[PDB]
Design a protein around this nucleic acid. Structure first.
Lengths: 53, 240, 153, 141, 83, 167, 65
RNA sequence: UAUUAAUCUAGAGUGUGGUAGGGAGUUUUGGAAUUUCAUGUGGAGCGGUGAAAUGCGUAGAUAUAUGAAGGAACACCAGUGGCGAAGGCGAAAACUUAGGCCAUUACUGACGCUUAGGCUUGAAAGUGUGGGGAGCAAAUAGGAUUAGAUACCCUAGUAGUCCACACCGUAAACGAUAGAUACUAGCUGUCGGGGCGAUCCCCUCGGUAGUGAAGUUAACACAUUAAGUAUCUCGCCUGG
């Protein structure tokens, strides 16, 4: 994930990218299950269909 | 004439994809562009039935109400109804029970009138904070009783601008034995009103016409000049 | 307008300290002319709850037809899963029923009836089920007129 | 009356009749369709003769093999349907056969029973009079 | 590879009959052989094992009917896989 | 059985070795043929895929017997000159509808939509208009006619009037 | 904004409509969900398979731009 | 009620045209990333929770960057989901390919469905054999809050987890909803088919879901896939 815009604007655009990577890769330090993975996929689908629509 | 095709300039149209099976009778099914269109002939026949029934009720000399609970359009319509024929009417909040429960509301409106009479008789006999509280209470009673304060007796017949918009009115009318006249919409249900008329409130061409003709029925019943119900196309009161 | 009571339910709602006792009552109103009306209400004490239930019941009065004044067709009434079965008793076998069932049957103007209450013994749903069972019966005239065949046989 | 589409066969035809009629009165429908048997056409005709349901049309496509029937439900001027809920008596696995001595009268002389005794569909009164008993098919009152 | 049309035009009884009980049982037997090769190649195919049982016992039902109703209708059908 | 093959050659090497890869893969397909020899030039590979960071893209679309796939994949993976050997068949699911000429309007209007940046178009890439004629061709026909008729029945008109009169 | 029912090709494979497949692909080498693409989802799931193939084919990086 | 004969299919299903899906199993490949190995550097920390601690570490640990071996599963794509006999399936691909979907007029022509008997599968754990322990982790070892504590947590680590023959043939096997047949709105929203159009906003019929009419239920709540409507069948609950 490269971000090259300016001296500081590159990091301003990289803020969202870093947030996305942190939220995506945070699930490799605790217990999880594949059925629960599909469960949480459905849950986030419902969340984005109700709030983000 | 009486809900003639011309009088409804363009009253067809409603929200996208909301229609009951037995509302497929008075309102044709979903359009290619997702619009429930209100038919004209069935509107005319239903309004003819409602017109004759309200005419014979007025011959019976019962008490009626023209409901203007809606913000501006129907409120102005019922104001015109009242200025054309003198009749008790409700424009503010139709309370959740004012016909099945009206005893403690009769005493409430009597307290209101008595307090106004006393204030007319009174001229600053107390501290002004108590007068401020007096006006406070008067306006508190007005903001709930502002619609229902002109009738001292239960109505023998009532009209409705929308069956879902007047749930309290239709509920209190079904508690009693008075028939209901309403302007049903395709999102409403037709198993609730004693006189189902496919008149749109979103499209004003139907509701304005029906309010004017309901006024005119009791106007001609009272032997006074009649404004509408004989014109091929009445006043175009299209709301913006 | 007898406004006869059938059962009072001892109830209490928990609140911030103590328990508010607002025991409910259920009454049946009739005027010896076949009029029937059931009403359930509640208040702090007995008289207020009784008066409220009386008003609620008398607000709607219903009369049922009498022909061969038993439940001339076997029928079981359920209101909230309470079995109350009424079956035709001949006019010379004598009335055999339960107390609440006897009250409901005799208030309607009927005669000897073959009744049977089942399962639960909570009188509120007993009265509701008995009312539903007795009031859902159709008259011979009803089918005689609704059907094209005028003869009722 | 051309169907323009053939209906799908049920597990049993009398239960198809019951389901179609009950869902028609439940969905506020006035026309019902069912298979066409000599027994079933006879039962529909005898139901019509006793004022329970309206006109019936037997529809044959190219042979008696593919035959159905579409019948309207009776609706009195009071908007009350004459069909108070049809029921079957000749139930698959619950085939109840009553002799002439065991022919009953429906809810104490209010309803009509359909009895095919020995030659065809017969109403309750004629079945008692004909001193012949047999199968009881359906109950409509 | 399902043998969709090939097995159907073979055992026809009449001029135009693409659903003949004979051709239904022929299709069922062809699919049973194919799904048996499937099962021996794939021992852990549970869905296909269930489908194979369904097909084979429906073939048994169809054979029972074809013997029950008309002799000639299964006089030309004696090729059912056995032994 | 429909078949596609995508070949990726070893690294950023010259197109001559890409043609050598073509020749090598020619003999791998024993008798099932129909392939078309096309090249997509040199395209980079973003992440290290097997050992390389770029390749030359080739596609061969044959059809026929489906047994000449496993051997192709193994001989192309064993050979160092190929890094991707991919073969596509029915497990890839797509459309080949017999009635595709009614979609030519879509063919023209999406290319118009992809060229919506010109002023000469009024239709947006997502524009609600409902232009379909709603053809069905979805009725199972049957020829039948009535045989009996008895007891005509009628009812009142469907406008409820409570008590019918209040005079 | 569909790109395969709109184009009417109806034929999805590896390399014949790659730009149409990438129309649902963000520059971040990630595909937008159904709630963002809003298409018939036959073509969107075909995009899913085709671009996961592309990641396997190293057309677009796994975790990179 | 059951049988007899055949044409009609209209459910059993079948044909032609199309057809979505991570179905399943078997097979093929790949490395983003970690560990070992290779190059190094570097100074005093790393490891981590509730505060920390066990533990690794001056011999070079943690870190720092890629590369061969290794094996796990394959960020987004992922759907008010699809498929799937519930069970379960998400890098990609192939073989068999089950079943989902309509246009299904056409087609043997009642053949049918449940189904105790029986057959199969039913996650995963664990475990007999052959592997890796790279990574994880039951058991295990330590520190730690509980009055201890085996229980929260953290660190490591054997079988095992992962693969194949597989076994236990058990579940929170959940839609806590047995199947098959015929029918029942609307609407909310995901999907398939045919049809015809730019795609959504088009129709029809279905798969998986919901609010909700009639209908049903003890209410919550089912509601087109019923717990409905009726049928058919099997099994079970007649108190803990």
């Amino acid at each position: 994930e490269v971000k090259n815009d300016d001296l500081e604007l590159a990091l301003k655009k990289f803020k969202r990218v870093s947030l996305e990577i942190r939220r995506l890769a945070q699930r490799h330090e605790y217990h999880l299950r594949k059925g629960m993975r599909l469960r949480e996929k459905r849950k986030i689908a419902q969340k984005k269909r109700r709030k983000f629509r | 004439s009486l809900a003639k095709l011309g009088e409804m300039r363009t009253h067809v149209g409603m929200v996208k994809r909301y229609w009951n099976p037995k509302m497929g009778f008075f309102i044709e099914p979903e359009r290619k562009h997702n619009n429930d269109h209100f038919v004209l002939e069935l509107q005319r026949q239903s309004l003819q039935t409602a017109y004759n029934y309200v005419k014979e009720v007025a011959q019976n000399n019962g008490q009626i109400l023209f409901v203007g609970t809606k913000n501006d359009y129907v409120k102005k319509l019922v104001n015109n109804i009242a200025k054309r024929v003198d009749v008790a009417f409700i424009t503010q909040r139709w309370l959740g029970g004012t016909l099945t429960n009206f005893k403690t509301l009769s005493i409430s409106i009597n307290k209101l009138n008595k307090l106004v009479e006393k204030q007319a008789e009174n001229a600053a006999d107390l501290t002004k904070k108590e007068n401020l509280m007096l006006s406070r209470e008067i306006e508190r009673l007005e903001k709930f009783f502002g619609g229902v304060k002109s009738l001292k007796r239960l109505p023998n017949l009532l009209i409705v601008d929308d069956p879902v918009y007047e749930k309290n009115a239709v509920a209190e009318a079904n508690i009693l034995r008075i028939p209901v006249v309403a302007l049903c919409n395709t999102n409403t249900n037709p198993e609730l009103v004693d006189f189902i008329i496919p008149a749109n409130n979103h499209q004003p061409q139907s509701t304005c016409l029906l309010m004017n003709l309901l006024a005119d029925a009791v106007a001609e019943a009272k032997a006074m000049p009649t404004m509408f119900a004989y014109k091929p196309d009445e006043e175009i009161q299209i709301e913006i | 307008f007898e406004e006869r009571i059938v059962k009072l339910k001892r109830i209490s709602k928990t609140t911030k300290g103590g328990r508010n006792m607002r025991f409910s009552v259920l009454v049946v109103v009739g005027n010896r002319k076949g009029k029937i009306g059931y009403g359930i209400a509640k208040a702090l004490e007995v008289p207020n709850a009784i008066k409220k239930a009386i008003k609620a019941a008398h607000n709607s009065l219903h009369t049922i037809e009498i022909h061969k004044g038993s439940i001339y067709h076997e029928v079981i009434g359920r209101s909230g899963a309470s079995r109350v079965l009424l079956k035709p008793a001949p006019q010379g076998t004598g009335i055999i029923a339960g107390g609440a069932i006897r009250a409901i049957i005799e208030l309607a103007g009927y005669s000897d009836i073959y009744t049977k209450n089942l399962g639960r013994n909570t009188p509120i749903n007993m009265i509701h089920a008995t009312m539903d069972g007795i009031l859902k019966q159709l008259s011979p005239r009803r089918v005689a007129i609704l059907r094209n065949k005028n003869l009722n046989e | 009356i051309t169907t323009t589409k053939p209906i799908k066969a049920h597990f049993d035809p009398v239960a198809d009749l019951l389901t179609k009629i009950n869902n028609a009165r439940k969905a506020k429908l006035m026309t019902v369709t069912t298979i066409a048997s000599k027994l079933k056409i006879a039962i529909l005709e005898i139901l019509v003769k006793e004022g329970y349901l309206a006109n019936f049309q037997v529809l044959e496509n190219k042979s008696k093999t593919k035959r159905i029937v579409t019948f309207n439900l009776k609706y009195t001027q009071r908007r009350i349907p004459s069909i108070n809920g049809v029921k079957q008596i000749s139930k698959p696995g619950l085939r109840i056969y009553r002799p002439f001595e065991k022919l009953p009268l429906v809810l104490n002389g209010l309803g009509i029973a359909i009895i095919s005794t020995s030659d065809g569909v017969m109403t309750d009164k004629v079945a008692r009079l004909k001193k012949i008993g047999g199968e009881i098919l359906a109950y409509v009152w | 590879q399902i043998d969709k049309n090939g097995i159907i035009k073979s055992a026809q009884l009449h001029d135009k009959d693409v659903g003949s009980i004979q051709v239904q049982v022929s299709l069922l037997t062809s699919q049973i052989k194919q799904l048996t090769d499937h099962l021996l190649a794939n021992k852990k195919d549970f869905i296909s094992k269930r489908g194979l049982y369904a097909k084979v016992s429906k073939r048994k039902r169809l054979l029972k009917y074809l013997k029950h109703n008309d002799l000639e209708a299964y006089r030309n059908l004696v090729k059912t896989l056995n032994l | 059985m429909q078949y596609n093959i995508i070949l990726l050659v070893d690294g950023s090497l010259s197109l001559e070795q890409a043609n050598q890869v073509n020749e090598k893969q020619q003999q791998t397909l024993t008798n099932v043929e129909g392939l078309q020899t096309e090249y997509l030039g040199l395209k980079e590979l973003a992440y290290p895929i097997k050992k390389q960071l770029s390749a030359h893209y080739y596609r061969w679309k044959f059809s026929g017997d489906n047994q000449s796939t496993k051997d192709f994949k193994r001989t192309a993976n064993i050979n160092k000159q190929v890094l991707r050997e991919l073969i596509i068949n029915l497990e890839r699911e797509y459309g080949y509808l017999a009635s595709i000429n009614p979609k030519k309007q879509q063919l023209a209007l999406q290319k118009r939509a992809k060229y919506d940046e010109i002023i000469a178009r009024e239709n947006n890439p997502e524009n609600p208009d409902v232009p379909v004629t709603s053809g069905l061709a979805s009725t199972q026909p049957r020829l039948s006619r009535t045989e009996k008729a008895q007891k005509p029945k009628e009812e009142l008109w469907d406008v409820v009037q409570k008590m019918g009169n209040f005079d | 904004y569909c790109r395969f029912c709109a184009i009417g090709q109806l034929r999805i494979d590896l390399i014949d409509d790659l730009e149409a497949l990438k129309r649902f692909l963000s520059p971040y080498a990630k595909i937008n969900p159904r709630r963002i693409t809003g298409n018939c989802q036959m073509h969107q799931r075909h995009v899913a398979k085709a671009l996961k193939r592309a990641r396997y084919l190293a057309l677009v990086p796994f975790v990179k731009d």
